[PDB]
Amino acid sequence: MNNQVEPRKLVVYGREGCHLCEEMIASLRVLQKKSWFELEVINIDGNEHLTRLYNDRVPVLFAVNEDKELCHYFLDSDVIGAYLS
């Protein structure tokens, strides 16, 4: 009868060990308990194309299976809340 669909994956673009990244990771790990979206941290320092996009506006929460940016450093929560579930 009913059956929830498969979730959307989320990627966080960043560079090296940044506190905001860790804080967002912890935030998303908590959210993963409510809504699974995986967690992938990708270094933009190598991909200068991504650095051209973000650079300073990193810990960026990218929506996979959709291909758009949702949030960035300092979790908005509201936006991904409206998005993920």
PDB file of all heavy atoms in Angstrom, residues 13-32:
ATOM      1  N   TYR A  13      30.719  20.782   0.385  1.00  0.00           N
ATOM      2  CA  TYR A  13      31.970  21.224  -0.215  1.00  0.00           C
ATOM      3  C   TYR A  13      32.784  22.018   0.794  1.00  0.00           C
ATOM      4  O   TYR A  13      32.256  22.908   1.464  1.00  0.00           O
ATOM      5  CB  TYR A  13      31.708  22.083  -1.452  1.00  0.00           C
ATOM      6  CG  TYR A  13      31.084  21.338  -2.611  1.00  0.00           C
ATOM      7  CD1 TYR A  13      29.780  21.603  -3.004  1.00  0.00           C
ATOM      8  CD2 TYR A  13      31.804  20.383  -3.318  1.00  0.00           C
ATOM      9  CE1 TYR A  13      29.209  20.937  -4.072  1.00  0.00           C
ATOM     10  CE2 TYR A  13      31.238  19.710  -4.385  1.00  0.00           C
ATOM     11  CZ  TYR A  13      29.941  19.991  -4.759  1.00  0.00           C
ATOM     12  OH  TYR A  13      29.375  19.331  -5.829  1.00  0.00           O
ATOM     13  N   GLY A  14      34.065  21.696   0.905  1.00  0.00           N
ATOM     14  CA  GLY A  14      34.921  22.391   1.843  1.00  0.00           C
ATOM     15  C   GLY A  14      36.386  22.252   1.498  1.00  0.00           C
ATOM     16  O   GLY A  14      36.736  21.882   0.377  1.00  0.00           O
ATOM     17  N   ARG A  15      37.242  22.556   2.462  1.00  0.00           N
ATOM     18  CA  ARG A  15      38.683  22.449   2.286  1.00  0.00           C
ATOM     19  C   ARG A  15      39.369  22.313   3.641  1.00  0.00           C
ATOM     20  O   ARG A  15      39.217  23.176   4.508  1.00  0.00           O
ATOM     21  CB  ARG A  15      39.236  23.669   1.538  1.00  0.00           C
ATOM     22  CG  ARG A  15      38.804  24.999   2.128  1.00  0.00           C
ATOM     23  CD  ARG A  15      39.747  26.119   1.723  1.00  0.00           C
ATOM     24  NE  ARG A  15      41.106  25.892   2.227  1.00  0.00           N
ATOM     25  CZ  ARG A  15      42.218  26.218   1.565  1.00  0.00           C
ATOM     26  NH1 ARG A  15      42.137  26.826   0.386  1.00  0.00           N
ATOM     27  NH2 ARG A  15      43.406  25.945   2.089  1.00  0.00           N
ATOM     28  N   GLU A  16      40.102  21.216   3.816  1.00  0.00           N
ATOM     29  CA  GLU A  16      40.850  20.951   5.047  1.00  0.00           C
ATOM     30  C   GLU A  16      39.916  20.836   6.256  1.00  0.00           C
ATOM     31  O   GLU A  16      38.691  20.787   6.111  1.00  0.00           O
ATOM     32  CB  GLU A  16      41.907  22.040   5.281  1.00  0.00           C
ATOM     33  CG  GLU A  16      42.867  22.213   4.114  1.00  0.00           C
ATOM     34  CD  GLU A  16      43.963  23.216   4.399  1.00  0.00           C
ATOM     35  OE1 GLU A  16      43.702  24.435   4.315  1.00  0.00           O
ATOM     36  OE2 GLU A  16      45.101  22.790   4.683  1.00  0.00           O
ATOM     37  N   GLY A  17      40.498  20.773   7.445  1.00  0.00           N
ATOM     38  CA  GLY A  17      39.705  20.660   8.650  1.00  0.00           C
ATOM     39  C   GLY A  17      39.243  22.009   9.160  1.00  0.00           C
ATOM     40  O   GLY A  17      40.000  22.718   9.825  1.00  0.00           O
ATOM     41  N   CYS A  18      38.008  22.368   8.836  1.00  0.00           N
ATOM     42  CA  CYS A  18      37.417  23.612   9.309  1.00  0.00           C
ATOM     43  C   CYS A  18      36.352  23.317  10.361  1.00  0.00           C
ATOM     44  O   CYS A  18      35.617  22.332  10.248  1.00  0.00           O
ATOM     45  CB  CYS A  18      36.809  24.387   8.135  1.00  0.00           C
ATOM     46  SG  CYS A  18      35.917  25.889   8.611  1.00  0.00           S
ATOM     47  N   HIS A  19      36.273  24.165  11.383  1.00  0.00           N
ATOM     48  CA  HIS A  19      35.313  23.974  12.464  1.00  0.00           C
ATOM     49  C   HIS A  19      33.879  23.983  11.960  1.00  0.00           C
ATOM     50  O   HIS A  19      33.084  23.134  12.352  1.00  0.00           O
ATOM     51  CB  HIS A  19      35.493  25.034  13.551  1.00  0.00           C
ATOM     52  CG  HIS A  19      36.374  24.583  14.675  1.00  0.00           C
ATOM     53  ND1 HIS A  19      36.456  25.240  15.882  1.00  0.00           N
ATOM     54  CD2 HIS A  19      37.205  23.523  14.771  1.00  0.00           C
ATOM     55  CE1 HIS A  19      37.298  24.601  16.670  1.00  0.00           C
ATOM     56  NE2 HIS A  19      37.767  23.553  16.020  1.00  0.00           N
ATOM     57  N   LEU A  20      33.550  24.927  11.085  1.00  0.00           N
ATOM     58  CA  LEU A  20      32.197  25.015  10.542  1.00  0.00           C
ATOM     59  C   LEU A  20      31.804  23.728   9.834  1.00  0.00           C
ATOM     60  O   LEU A  20      30.646  23.314   9.892  1.00  0.00           O
ATOM     61  CB  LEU A  20      32.057  26.205   9.593  1.00  0.00           C
ATOM     62  CG  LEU A  20      32.078  27.577  10.268  1.00  0.00           C
ATOM     63  CD1 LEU A  20      31.851  28.680   9.244  1.00  0.00           C
ATOM     64  CD2 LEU A  20      31.027  27.643  11.366  1.00  0.00           C
ATOM     65  N   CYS A  21      32.768  23.089   9.182  1.00  0.00           N
ATOM     66  CA  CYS A  21      32.525  21.804   8.543  1.00  0.00           C
ATOM     67  C   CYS A  21      32.139  20.764   9.594  1.00  0.00           C
ATOM     68  O   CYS A  21      31.122  20.088   9.462  1.00  0.00           O
ATOM     69  CB  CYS A  21      33.765  21.342   7.773  1.00  0.00           C
ATOM     70  SG  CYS A  21      34.273  22.461   6.449  1.00  0.00           S
ATOM     71  N   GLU A  22      32.941  20.682  10.653  1.00  0.00           N
ATOM     72  CA  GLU A  22      32.698  19.740  11.743  1.00  0.00           C
ATOM     73  C   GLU A  22      31.342  19.987  12.398  1.00  0.00           C
ATOM     74  O   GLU A  22      30.595  19.043  12.671  1.00  0.00           O
ATOM     75  CB  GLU A  22      33.806  19.852  12.790  1.00  0.00           C
ATOM     76  CG  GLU A  22      35.166  19.389  12.295  1.00  0.00           C
ATOM     77  CD  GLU A  22      35.195  17.907  11.987  1.00  0.00           C
ATOM     78  OE1 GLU A  22      35.183  17.100  12.939  1.00  0.00           O
ATOM     79  OE2 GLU A  22      35.238  17.541  10.796  1.00  0.00           O
ATOM     80  N   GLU A  23      31.032  21.256  12.641  1.00  0.00           N
ATOM     81  CA  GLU A  23      29.769  21.637  13.265  1.00  0.00           C
ATOM     82  C   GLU A  23      28.590  21.227  12.389  1.00  0.00           C
ATOM     83  O   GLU A  23      27.585  20.706  12.882  1.00  0.00           O
ATOM     84  CB  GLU A  23      29.736  23.146  13.518  1.00  0.00           C
ATOM     85  CG  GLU A  23      30.886  23.647  14.376  1.00  0.00           C
ATOM     86  CD  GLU A  23      30.922  23.026  15.758  1.00  0.00           C
ATOM     87  OE1 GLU A  23      31.453  21.905  15.907  1.00  0.00           O
ATOM     88  OE2 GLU A  23      30.438  23.668  16.714  1.00  0.00           O
ATOM     89  N   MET A  24      28.720  21.450  11.083  1.00  0.00           N
ATOM     90  CA  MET A  24      27.671  21.069  10.142  1.00  0.00           C
ATOM     91  C   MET A  24      27.568  19.557  10.028  1.00  0.00           C
ATOM     92  O   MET A  24      26.469  19.015   9.920  1.00  0.00           O
ATOM     93  CB  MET A  24      27.894  21.681   8.756  1.00  0.00           C
ATOM     94  CG  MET A  24      27.645  23.177   8.701  1.00  0.00           C
ATOM     95  SD  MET A  24      27.756  23.847   7.030  1.00  0.00           S
ATOM     96  CE  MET A  24      26.449  22.940   6.198  1.00  0.00           C
ATOM     97  N   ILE A  25      28.710  18.873  10.058  1.00  0.00           N
ATOM     98  CA  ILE A  25      28.721  17.416  10.055  1.00  0.00           C
ATOM     99  C   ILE A  25      27.912  16.887  11.231  1.00  0.00           C
ATOM    100  O   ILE A  25      27.045  16.035  11.058  1.00  0.00           O
ATOM    101  CB  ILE A  25      30.158  16.840  10.111  1.00  0.00           C
ATOM    102  CG1 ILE A  25      30.903  17.142   8.808  1.00  0.00           C
ATOM    103  CG2 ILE A  25      30.128  15.337  10.370  1.00  0.00           C
ATOM    104  CD1 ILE A  25      32.344  16.676   8.804  1.00  0.00           C
ATOM    105  N   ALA A  26      28.179  17.421  12.420  1.00  0.00           N
ATOM    106  CA  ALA A  26      27.441  17.035  13.614  1.00  0.00           C
ATOM    107  C   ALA A  26      25.952  17.326  13.445  1.00  0.00           C
ATOM    108  O   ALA A  26      25.105  16.516  13.819  1.00  0.00           O
ATOM    109  CB  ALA A  26      27.991  17.758  14.833  1.00  0.00           C
ATOM    110  N   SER A  27      25.649  18.477  12.852  1.00  0.00           N
ATOM    111  CA  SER A  27      24.271  18.875  12.592  1.00  0.00           C
ATOM    112  C   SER A  27      23.582  17.878  11.656  1.00  0.00           C
ATOM    113  O   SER A  27      22.463  17.432  11.916  1.00  0.00           O
ATOM    114  CB  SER A  27      24.251  20.276  11.972  1.00  0.00           C
ATOM    115  OG  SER A  27      24.893  21.218  12.821  1.00  0.00           O
ATOM    116  N   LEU A  28      24.271  17.519  10.582  1.00  0.00           N
ATOM    117  CA  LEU A  28      23.721  16.624   9.574  1.00  0.00           C
ATOM    118  C   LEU A  28      23.648  15.188  10.086  1.00  0.00           C
ATOM    119  O   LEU A  28      22.762  14.431   9.699  1.00  0.00           O
ATOM    120  CB  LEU A  28      24.560  16.699   8.296  1.00  0.00           C
ATOM    121  CG  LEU A  28      24.596  18.078   7.631  1.00  0.00           C
ATOM    122  CD1 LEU A  28      25.475  18.051   6.396  1.00  0.00           C
ATOM    123  CD2 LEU A  28      23.191  18.534   7.274  1.00  0.00           C
ATOM    124  N   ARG A  29      24.578  14.817  10.956  1.00  0.00           N
ATOM    125  CA  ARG A  29      24.559  13.494  11.576  1.00  0.00           C
ATOM    126  C   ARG A  29      23.315  13.330  12.434  1.00  0.00           C
ATOM    127  O   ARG A  29      22.702  12.263  12.462  1.00  0.00           O
ATOM    128  CB  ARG A  29      25.814  13.270  12.422  1.00  0.00           C
ATOM    129  CG  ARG A  29      27.070  13.056  11.594  1.00  0.00           C
ATOM    130  CD  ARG A  29      27.053  11.706  10.892  1.00  0.00           C
ATOM    131  NE  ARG A  29      27.155  10.604  11.847  1.00  0.00           N
ATOM    132  CZ  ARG A  29      26.487   9.453  11.750  1.00  0.00           C
ATOM    133  NH1 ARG A  29      25.657   9.233  10.734  1.00  0.00           N
ATOM    134  NH2 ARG A  29      26.652   8.519  12.678  1.00  0.00           N
ATOM    135  N   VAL A  30      22.945  14.397  13.129  1.00  0.00           N
ATOM    136  CA  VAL A  30      21.714  14.413  13.905  1.00  0.00           C
ATOM    137  C   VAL A  30      20.503  14.324  12.980  1.00  0.00           C
ATOM    138  O   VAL A  30      19.575  13.555  13.232  1.00  0.00           O
ATOM    139  CB  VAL A  30      21.607  15.682  14.780  1.00  0.00           C
ATOM    140  CG1 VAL A  30      20.267  15.739  15.499  1.00  0.00           C
ATOM    141  CG2 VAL A  30      22.744  15.732  15.785  1.00  0.00           C
ATOM    142  N   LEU A  31      20.527  15.101  11.899  1.00  0.00           N
ATOM    143  CA  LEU A  31      19.445  15.080  10.918  1.00  0.00           C
ATOM    144  C   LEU A  31      19.318  13.717  10.255  1.00  0.00           C
ATOM    145  O   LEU A  31      18.215  13.273   9.965  1.00  0.00           O
ATOM    146  CB  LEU A  31      19.646  16.152   9.847  1.00  0.00           C
ATOM    147  CG  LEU A  31      19.027  17.512  10.160  1.00  0.00           C
ATOM    148  CD1 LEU A  31      19.274  18.475   9.013  1.00  0.00           C
ATOM    149  CD2 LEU A  31      17.532  17.370  10.425  1.00  0.00           C
ATOM    150  N   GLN A  32      20.451  13.054  10.034  1.00  0.00           N
ATOM    151  CA  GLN A  32      20.477  11.726   9.417  1.00  0.00           C
ATOM    152  C   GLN A  32      19.669  10.710  10.218  1.00  0.00           C
ATOM    153  O   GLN A  32      19.251   9.681   9.685  1.00  0.00           O
ATOM    154  CB  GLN A  32      21.916  11.239   9.253  1.00  0.00           C
ATOM    155  CG  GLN A  32      22.559  11.677   7.948  1.00  0.00           C
ATOM    156  CD  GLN A  32      24.052  11.407   7.906  1.00  0.00           C
ATOM    157  OE1 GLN A  32      24.550  10.501   8.570  1.00  0.00           O
ATOM    158  NE2 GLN A  32      24.775  12.170   7.105  1.00  0.00           N
TER     159      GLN A  32
END
